[PDB]
């Protein structure tokens, strides 16, 4: 119990003996974990090139308060994300982390891969229903769906004129683009937008948005 | 071989540290985007001008678009390409009035922090590692 | 300029946004499902990470900042030797104070207890 509270707030330096980069030695906040082995973050194991066919690290505990200060404030992983060589990120997702994201954003099958014959989908009022329907096995991850978009035009699609515009005689005209439907009117200025996407794209977009909001609420400078 | 090259590279510049704000130099390396594109790509030409501190004012007619000791971002660099200016003089470690150290302006903007480099940064050792680290990364006719 | 009615009170034009802001309707919403994230962030300790950067935003040299923090942390421990040994750390107390000096609110030294700890001998095993 004393050891658990002692390590709390005291950073340690993890060093790979066959050192590779400036990240070959780095500081982490230790947490007491079970077993007889040193658990390490998957992302930082690429900065250390820490293969899991066998590796042993040397760990050093700063003693002086000055050393503990600069270990926490200069060597922590959250402040060293850009490689000084060119200024590119180092903790980029790789391996199965990149595979999982690729599968998420690998959207619907298109064209002849989706329909057996030449033609010659659910509408969700918000992303939460689309996620919820996916949980209830109502739709697949890659199954196409229409999302009622309340924000501004935000999706990145090739700048192309609408595939087809359905101009009703009463002034309402629908603009069918390659990836979204926009319902404008002459009498009014409703500007309804429906995005044709998948749960995977919604899940990936929601994950980034929730991460930002979750970090903002935790660091509530407003209060 | 790369590990041996790292030790020699870091040794020659182990003493280089950002110790002054502005060394007061006036000479700047002049780069022109019209005599260069014939050999190398334009994309890498942007990286050469990203993070640099301009050594002299740049004018487009009577309009002044950049100033001396002004950091160069992608917005300013793209402006130079679009309007086809050529008298671009930037501060480089070649233009610093010292060899045992380097000032902040002559070096430029730190790639890691996205702002002007801070005093006391062991910038020489960073340069040595930035070249030695890619050492372990280096037909039809 | 000055205009008053019969009662003598002053009547002024209430300056209001005449036109319409597109971004106003696109940004007032808040996500509802970050309760587990915000709790995890505080428990992990990333709330200090944002505070550490926030202090560096108003700083001129990050090497002077750590020296100042280390100097102030050494000052704290000299005054109160028997306080910064366990759940409270000297450096974390400095960081919490420096954030509180800006006018914001943080727990002292970012220290957190375990309200769900069953017994004195039970220490939270970490699921690796």
């Amino acid at each position: 119990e004393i050891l658990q509270e002692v390590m709390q707030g005291h950073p340690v330096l993890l060093n790979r003996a066959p050192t590779l980069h400036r990240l070959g030695i780095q500081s982490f906040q230790p947490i007491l974990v079970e077993g007889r082995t040193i658990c390490l973050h998957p992302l930082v194991c690429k900065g250390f090139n820490a293969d899991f066919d066998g590796d042993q690290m040397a760990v050093h505990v700063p003693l002086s308060l000055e050393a503990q200060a600069e270990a926490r404030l200069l060597m922590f992983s959250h402040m060293n994300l850009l490689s000084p060589a060119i200024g590119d990120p180092i903790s980029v997702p790789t391996q199965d982390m990149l595979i999982g994201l690729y599968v998420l954003t690998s959207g619907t099958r298109r064209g002849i891969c989706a329909n057996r014959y030449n033609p010659c989908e659910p509408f969700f009022c918000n992303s939460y229903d689309a996620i919820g329907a996916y949980r209830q096995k109502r739709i697949n991850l890659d199954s196409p769906l229409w999302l009622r978009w309340q924000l501004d035009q935000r999706v990145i699609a090739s700048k192309e004129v609408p595939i087809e515009v359905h101009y009703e005689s009463f002034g309402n005209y629908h603009e069918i683009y390659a990836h979204y439907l926009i319902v404008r009117s002459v009498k009014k200025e409703t500007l309804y937008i429906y995005i044709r996407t998948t749960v995977g794209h919604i899940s990936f977009y929601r994950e980034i948005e929730e991460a930002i909001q979750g970090f903002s609420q935790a660091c509530s400078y407003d209060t | 071989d790369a590990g041996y090259l790292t030790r020699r590279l870091v040794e020659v510049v182990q003493h280089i540290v950002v110790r002054r704000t502005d060394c007061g130099t006036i000479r700047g390396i002049s780069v022109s985007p019209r005599n260069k594109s014939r050999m190398m790509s334009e994309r890498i030409f942007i990286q050469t001008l990203i993070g640099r501190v301009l050594a002299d004012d740049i004018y487009i007619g009577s309009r002044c678009v950049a100033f001396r000791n002004q950091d160069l971002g992608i917005g300013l660099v793209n402006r130079f390409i679009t309007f086809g200016t050529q008298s671009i003089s930037i501060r480089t470690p070649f233009t610093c009035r010292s060899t045992s150290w380097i000032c902040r302006l002559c070096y430029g903007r730190s790639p890691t922090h996205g702002d002007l480099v801070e005093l006391g940064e062991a910038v020489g050792i960073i340069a040595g590692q930035s070249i030695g680290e890619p050492g372990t990364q280096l037909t039809g006719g | 300029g000055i205009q008053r009615d019969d009662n003598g009170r002053r009547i002024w034009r209430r300056r209001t946004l005449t036109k319409k802001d597109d971004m106003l309707r696109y940004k007032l919403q808040r996500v509802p499902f970050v309760e587990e994230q915000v709790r995890k962030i505080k428990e992990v300790g990333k709330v200090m990470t944002m505070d550490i950067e926030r202090l560096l935003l108003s700083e001129d040299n990050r090497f002077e900042f750590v020296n100042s923090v280390a100097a102030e942390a050494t000052e704290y421990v000299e005054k109160n030797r028997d306080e910064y040994g366990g759940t409270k750390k000297a450096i974390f107390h400095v960081l919490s104070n420096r954030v509180n000096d800006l006018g914001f609110d943080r727990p002292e030294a970012y220290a957190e207890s375990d309200p769900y700890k069953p017994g004195p001998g039970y220490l939270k095993e970490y699921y690796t």
């Binding site: 000055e66 600069e70 200069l74 | 110790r19 006391g120 062991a122 | 090497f63 020296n67």
Partner: peptide, 8 residues
Amino acid sequence: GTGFNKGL
């Protein structure tokens, strides 16, 4: 770094 000048 932190040792630049004398820390002051």
